[PDB]
């Protein structure tokens, strides 16, 4: 009945003892990576910030600086991601994605399509405080087409409240989305962007259902997942996030590991950002939709302490 992550507050938390444990794991020429990853993956993000404070008070050193030099590679990147304050994670990920012509549209689409209006409001406020600019201005400056416009509408976080189902509106919206897809999402973009971006989640769930009966196929089938452009990818992420945010992010994890190579940036990002929100539900959708557990997939694609920390973040095997 509730969303649910895999990381919770550690019972009997003593930030000073945890700071000594992390310092003992790093003081000297050696490194106890096992002790570091066991402690940090079992402490909540808020507790990690308290350890960071006690670490500086007791020893006069910066914990994040110590971890960066003591650790290397993907394990270091995972630990650094876990130490970033939860209030700042998405805003930092978006600013990093908005890098000129090398803009990472996947990160923009992933965060902006799957975050709630309340989360997007906090992101916009934190983004301004950190980088001196507005997220909208940075988005408009680095994106184009109606992909930019759909990102702007979603960022406004003005989605209608979950209210009573209006059958006349569901029929009119499903008809319009069918005619927009017939034109390959290249005509009257403001029209379907307004439907995708400002209609309530429960309303759009019904619109997607009325779309199935009217057209004979689900609305996702009008967009090729691999070859489609940015707007169509964003539409696909919004539609899937409307159905189930954990299902969309589980599919995102799945394709980050399917095939050759591993999208470790996406693996780390989704694992960490959702660790205290809905990573458990993501695991449930992962097992249900891809016939294998998130745990077993991480075990087969990663290595070293990076794999150890990822599996502990995952929590447990499924099935």
Nearer to Ca ion, 177 or 314 (CB): 314
Which residue, 127 or 147, has its beta carbon nearer to Ca ion?
127
Q: State the Cα–Cα distance between residues 231 and 45, nearest whole angstrom.
A: 34
Nearer to Ca ion, 213 or 227 (CB): 227
Q: Which is nearer to Ca ion, 144 or 289 (CB)?
A: 289
Closer CB to Ca ion, 122 or 140, in the complex: 122
Question: Among residues 180 and 253, whose Cβ is nearest to Ca ion?
Answer: 253
Chain positions contacting Ca ion, by CB under 5 A: 26, 30-32, 72, 119, 122-123, 263
Which CB, 123 or 314, lies closer to Ca ion?
A: 123
Backbone angles phi, psi at 117, to 5 degrees: -55, -40
Residue 154 CB, shortest distance to Ca ion, in Å, is 14
Closest approach, Cβ 284 to Ca ion, in A, equals 22
**Token pair for 305:** 């302490």
User: Looking at beta carbons only, is 26 or 309 nearer to Ca ion?
Assistant: 26
Residues 6+ apart with CB under 8 A from 92: 84, 130
CB of 275 to Ca ion, least distance (A): 14
Q: Exposed e or buried b for every residue in 59-77, given b needs 16+ CB within 10 A?
A: eeeebeebbeebbeebbbb
| Smallest distance, Ca ion to C-beta of residue 189, A | 28
Q: Are 203 and 177 in contact (CB under 8 A)?
A: no
- Two tokens, residue 145: 């087409």
In whole angstroms, how close is the CB of 117 to Ca ion at the nearest point?
A: 10
CA distance 279 to 35: 23
Long-range pairs of 59-63 with CB within 8 A, sequence gap ≥ 24: 59/19, 59/23, 61/23, 63/19, 63/22
Q: How far is the CB of 32 from Ca ion (least distance, A)?
A: 5
CB of 68 to Ca ion, least distance (A): 5
CB of 237 to Ca ion, least distance (A): 17
Measured distance CA(29)–CA(196) in Å, rounded: 55
């Amino acid at each position: 009945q509730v969303l649910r992550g895999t990381v919770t507050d550690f019972p009997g938390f003593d930030e000073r003892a945890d700071a000594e444990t992390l310092r003992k794991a790093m003081k000297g020429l050696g490194t106890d990576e096992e002790s570091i990853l066991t402690l940090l993956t079992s402490r909540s993000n808020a507790q990690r910030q308290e350890i960071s404070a006690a670490f500086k008070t007791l020893f006069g050193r910066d914990l994040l600086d110590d971890l960066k030099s003591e650790l290397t590679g993907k394990f270091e990147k995972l630990i650094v991601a876990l130490m970033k304050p939860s209030r700042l994670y998405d805003a930092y990920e978006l600013k990093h994605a908005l890098k000129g012509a090398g803009t990472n549209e996947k990160v923009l689409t992933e965060i902006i399509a799957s975050r709630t209006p309340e989360e997007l409001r906090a992101i916009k406020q934190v983004y301004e405080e950190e980088y001196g600019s507005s997220l909208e201005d940075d988005v408009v400056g680095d994106t184009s087409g109606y992909y930019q416009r759909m990102l702007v509408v979603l960022l406004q976080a003005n989605r209608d409240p979950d209210a009573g189902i209006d059958e006349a509106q569901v029929e009119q919206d499903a008809q319009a989305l069918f005619q927009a897809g017939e034109l390959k999402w290249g005509t009257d973009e403001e029209k379907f962007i307004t439907i995708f971006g400002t209609r309530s989640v429960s309303h759009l769930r019904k619109v997607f259902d009325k779309y199935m009966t009217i057209s004979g196929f689900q609305i996702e089938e009008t967009i090729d997942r691999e070859t489609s452009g940015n707007l169509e990818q964003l539409l696909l992420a919004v539609v899937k996030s409307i159905r189930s945010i954990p299902a969309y992010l589980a599919e995102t994890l799945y394709y980050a590991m399917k095939g050759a190579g591993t999208d470790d940036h996406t693996l780390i990002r989704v694992m960490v950002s959702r660790s205290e929100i809905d990573l458990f539900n993501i695991r449930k959708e992962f097992r249900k939709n891809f016939a294998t557990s998130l745990y077993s997939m991480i075990k087969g694609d990663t290595s070293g302490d990076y794999k150890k920390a990822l599996l502990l973040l995952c929590g447990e095997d499924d099935c």
